[PDB]
Design a binder for these strands. Structure first.
Ligand code: MG
Ligand code: MG
Ligand code: MG
Ligand code: MG
Ligand code: MG
Ligand code: MG
Ligand code: MG
Ligand code: MG
Ligand code: MG
Ligand code: MG
Ligand code: MG
Ligand code: MG
Ligand code: MG
Ligand code: MG
Ligand code: MG
Ligand code: MG
Ligand code: MG
Ligand code: MG
Ligand code: MG
Ligand code: MG
Ligand code: ZN
Lengths: 213, 174, 58, 146, 37
RNA sequence: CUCGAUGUCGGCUCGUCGCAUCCUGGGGCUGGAGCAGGUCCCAAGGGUUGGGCUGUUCGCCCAUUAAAGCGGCACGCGAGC
RNA sequence: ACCGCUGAAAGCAUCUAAGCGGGAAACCUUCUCCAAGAUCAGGUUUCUCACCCACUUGGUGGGAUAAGGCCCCCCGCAGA
């Protein structure tokens, strides 16, 4: 039931629908994928399928990975990821070496898009966690963006684990739910997905048929 | 006193006893049962059922009548099943039989449908009277109670689903 | 205790029985025997059991 | 000088304990004693003597109904309000071996030796274990009459 | 239901029982039923 | 206990916990016709506004709200203001 | 919480003692993220799959390689 594809975020644009309403879309080049591997419950303990996406010079792949691809009889690709299926294999619907193109999805369906969000570096509490800070005037001394108190007093004489402080922000795995597929352009292998998609332009993206729908 | 009575066997076609277990079949289907440990199920002079236990313990005097009446109900239901008659009151409240299930009109925006499980058969007589039938007394009572509680009690007008011959409470209100 | 329970007797009754039999070896050497000469320890356990009273709850 | 075991004197063996109708406390005491080796006259508190113990049928241990309903298991994650809580009933449904091994581990000395002693314990929910190559002798629980 | 530490029958037809380890009074008159608590 | 020093009210920032529950959730009784309510039981997941006055906490008022909860943590928090 | 079915002790009755149901934003799965230093350190795979010297002949010390990395170099929407 669960359908998946791997692609690249190509940036956003806008289109007008039939109601003459503007629709902001993200162009995802859901390029062709190869299966390259099937996980069976009998052999691995769960049911899933690998997917190979992206072109790469064969000289850029080391001998072990090249051997893994040769075992599947497929030319090496840049990326490799597993699509997890329900705990029932059904022992069907996928063959090693089979091609997956963009029209596994249809117009008007909903998808889940997971990617790697943009990095923000070391971030303060005001950006990272939406703290308020103290005022800009009325005597405040060098605390305009500082966090304030971080605990109680002699009880407990510690800071609780999971207290929100400054640190590295971004580069996370992020899934956006219930995105409407506005158009499936099978000619260019392009999905026009209404909304925003995590990550930078040119980053690896996994598109899955939505489960909440 | 209950439990100090033999259980007569009208048919009891396949009365079987296997380690405090029993099965009885007859004019209707079969029904099984497992008897509690300190209770002994044995035969009478006339093929009837009797139960016994070591005398004068609280936990055994309690289990005696229970284990007696359970097998009595089982054999009675095997001979002739149990049926419960239920009425419907209130203007516009009515019932119809839809295949194996049974539909209710009880003033809700949607209709209410009750599916009959295995061993239970519904039967409508009038648009406001019906009957639930079966062999297992507990199961018949359970289904009847589920149907009974379909509407919250109404002491003022009296609308809803009742048992036959039961007298609900009434209040005047306004 | 380990050696006695291996020979099917509690330390409790073994000590009672050895005192009843009038054996005056101390615990250091009893443990030494239990490690080194289990046959001798079994003989000692037999002596203690024999000297122990017939009913130990009277 | 009293005897002190040397490196290479300790001799291990393999026992299998069946948990069909044993109550949890009795089984845990027996397993802890076998693991530590207190039944060996060569016992020494600073030496990891004792044997390997395989416990099978961990789902058959005799636990009272009120204990399944009411005995409760607590874990704190370290975060505020992070006290999580299960019943012996839920544990017995999901990971029965964890109940047995938690009961056993509570009964061991709280030191560095017990970390190595507990490495010799195997608990299985089903009636079969993978250590057939090792030939574990069966072990029934005895009480010495006094 | 009334929930008080002291429960006792009010009218002549209030039965007094103990179910699930708790003393309570049940009667046909619904405003008579009480449980300890 | 602390006098060879344990910074004292209110506000700000950041919180965390309890439940004796303000709202939302589930119920019994009603001097519950319906809409609304009263009272008691269960329930701590989330939520629980902005201003005028006063240093104020508290309180009163204004306009809203599903609601504008009560408390602990050195009357939480000045090597954070 | 509350509402039951069947039902004795206790010939009646009783949601209970045997047994079986319904039942809430609380609890557990389900959704999102982390996670094998989970020291019980997991699994499925693919690659190398090979030498020399000394010696007290050692689960010994060195030396040189393979697969593969790292450093250096050109950069980044990755970043103290
Ligand atoms: Mg500001
Ligand atoms: Mg100043
Ligand atoms: Mg300054
Ligand atoms: Mg400044
Ligand atoms: Mg502390
Ligand atoms: Mg002072
Ligand atoms: Mg000082
Ligand atoms: Mg409360
Ligand atoms: Mg009410
Ligand atoms: Mg009125
Ligand atoms: Mg709450
Ligand atoms: Mg929850
Ligand atoms: Mg507070
Ligand atoms: Mg203070
Ligand atoms: Mg200061
Ligand atoms: Mg201050
Ligand atoms: Mg301070
Ligand atoms: Mg300080
Ligand atoms: Mg009844
Ligand atoms: Mg950990
Ligand atoms: Zn009354």
């Amino acid at each position: 039931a669960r359908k998946g594809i791997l692609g690249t975020k190509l940036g956003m644009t806008q289109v007008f629908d039939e109601s003459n309403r503007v629709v902001p879309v993200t162009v995802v080049k859901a390029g062709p994928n190869v299966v390259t591997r099937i996980r069976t419950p009998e052999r691995d303990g769960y049911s899933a399928v690998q997917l190979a996406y992206g072109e790469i010079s064969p000289r850029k792949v080391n001998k072990p990975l090249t051997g893994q691809y040769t075992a599947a009889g497929v030319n090496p690709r840049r990326y490799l990821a597993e699509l997890r299926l329900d705990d029932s294999d059904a022992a069907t619907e996928y063959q090693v070496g089979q091609e997956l193109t963009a029209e596994i999805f249809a117009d008007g369906s909903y998808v889940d898009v997971t990617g790697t969000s943009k990095g923000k570096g070391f971030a303060g509490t005001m950006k990272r966690h939406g703290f308020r800070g103290q005022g800009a005037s009325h005597g405040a001394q060098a605390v305009h963006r500082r966090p304030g108190s971080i605990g109680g007093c002699a009880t407990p004489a510690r800071v609780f684990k999971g207290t929100r402080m400054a640190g590295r922000m971004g580069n996370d795995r992020v899934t956006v739910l219930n995105l409407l597929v506005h158009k499936v352009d099978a000619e260019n292998g392009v999905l026009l997905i209404k909304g925003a998609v995590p990550g930078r332009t040119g980053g690896l993206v996994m598109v899955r048929s939505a489960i909440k729908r | 006193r209950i439990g100090k009575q033999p259980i007569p066997v009208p048919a009891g076609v396949d009365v079987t006893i296997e380690g405090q277990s029993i099965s009885v079949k007859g004019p209707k289907g079969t029904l099984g049962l497992t008897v509690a440990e300190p209770i002994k199920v044995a035969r009478n002079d006339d093929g009837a059922i009797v139960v016994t236990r070591p005398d004068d313990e609280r936990r055994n005097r309690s289990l005696h009548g229970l284990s007696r009446t359970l097998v009595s109900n089982l054999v009675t239901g095997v001979t002739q099943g149990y049926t419960t008659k239920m009425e419907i009151f209130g203007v516009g409240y009515r019932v119809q039989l839809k295949g194996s299930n049974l539909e209710f009109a009880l003033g809700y925006s949607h209709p209410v449908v009750i599916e009959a499980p295995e061993g239970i058969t519904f039967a409508v007589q009038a648009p406001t009277k019906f009957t639930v039938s079966g062999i297992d007394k507990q199961k018949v009572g359970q289904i009847a109670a589920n149907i009974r509680r379909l509407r919250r009690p109404d002491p003022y007008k009296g609308k809803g689903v009742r048992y036959e011959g039961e007298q609900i409470r009434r209040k005047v209100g306004k | 205790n380990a050696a006695a329970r291996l020979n099917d007797i509690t330390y409790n009754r073994l000590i009672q029985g050895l005192k009843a039999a009038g054996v005056e070896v101390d615990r250091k050497n009893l443990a030494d025997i239990a490690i080194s000469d289990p046959a001798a320890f079994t003989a000692l356990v037999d002596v203690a059991r024999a000297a122990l009273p017939e009913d130990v709850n009277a | 000088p009293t005897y002190a075991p040397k490196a290479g004197d300790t001799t291990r063996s393999w026992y299998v304990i069946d948990a069909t109708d044993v109550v949890l406390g009795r089984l845990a005491v027996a397993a802890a004693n076998l693991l530590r080796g207190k039944h060996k006259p060569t016992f020494a508190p600073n030496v990891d003597g004792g044997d390997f113990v395989i416990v099978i049928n961990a789902d058959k241990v005799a636990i009272s109904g009120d204990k399944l309903q009411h005995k409760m298991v607590y874990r704190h994650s370290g975060y505020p309000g992070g006290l999580h809580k299960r019943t012996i009933g839920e544990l017995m449904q999901r990971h029965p071996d964890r109940v047995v091994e938690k009961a056993i581990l509570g009964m061991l000395p709280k030191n560095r030796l017990s970390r190595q002693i507990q490495r010799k314990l195997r608990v299985y929910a089903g009636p079969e274990h993978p250590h057939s190559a090792q030939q574990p002798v069966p072990y029934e629980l005895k009480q010495v009459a006094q | 239901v009334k929930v008080n530490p002291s429960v006792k029958p009010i009218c002549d037809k209030c039965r007094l029982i103990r179910r699930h380890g708790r003393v309570m009074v049940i009667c046909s008159d619904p405003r008579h039923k009480q449980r300890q608590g």
